[PDB]
């Protein structure tokens, strides 16, 4: 919503839907699942989010990252925090 960020050149309906939950471990993991009728390559940008929703700025933060997704097949995408104050995510999706 304010959690997946949709470029203008990508479907609406791209996202399918979303969840997160705190691992055994004591980590934040989301899922989003993803589906397109057409094969489109996006690209991808995860910040994580605190407690309070502010964007932790001290962690490690992962590049933007290439995603193929195949025609009418469902891609869940899969990502998992690597510091326990890691309550939250966003994520941004544009077309290639
Ligand atoms: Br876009």
Same mark, same amino acid.
């Given at each position: 919503?304010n959690t997946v960020?949709?470029?203008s050149?990508?479907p609406?309906?791209?996202?399918?839907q979303?969840?997160?939950?705190?691992?055994?471990?004591?980590?934040? %993991?989301?899922?989003?699942? *993803? $589906?397109?009728?057409?094969?489109?390559? &996006? #690209?991808?940008?995860?910040?994580?989010? !605190?407690k309070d929703?502010?964007?932790?700025r001290?962690?490690?933060? %992962?590049?933007?990252?290439? *995603? $193929?997704?195949?025609?009418?097949?469902? &891609? #869940?995408?899969?990502?998992?925090?690597? !510091?326990?104050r890691?309550?939250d995510?966003?994520?941004?999706?544009?077309?290639?």
């Open positions: 919503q960020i949709l470029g050149n990508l609406k309906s791209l996202v399918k979303f969840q997160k939950r705190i691992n055994s471990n004591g980590y934040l %993991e989301f899922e989003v699942i *993803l $589906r397109s009728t057409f094969a489109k390559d &996006v #690209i991808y940008k995860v910040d994580w989010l !605190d929703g502010f964007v932790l001290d962690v490690l933060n %992962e590049d933007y990252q290439a *995603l $193929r997704i195949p025609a009418g097949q469902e &891609v #869940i995408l899969r990502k998992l925090a690597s !510091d326990t890691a309550n995510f966003r994520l941004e999706i544009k077309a290639k």
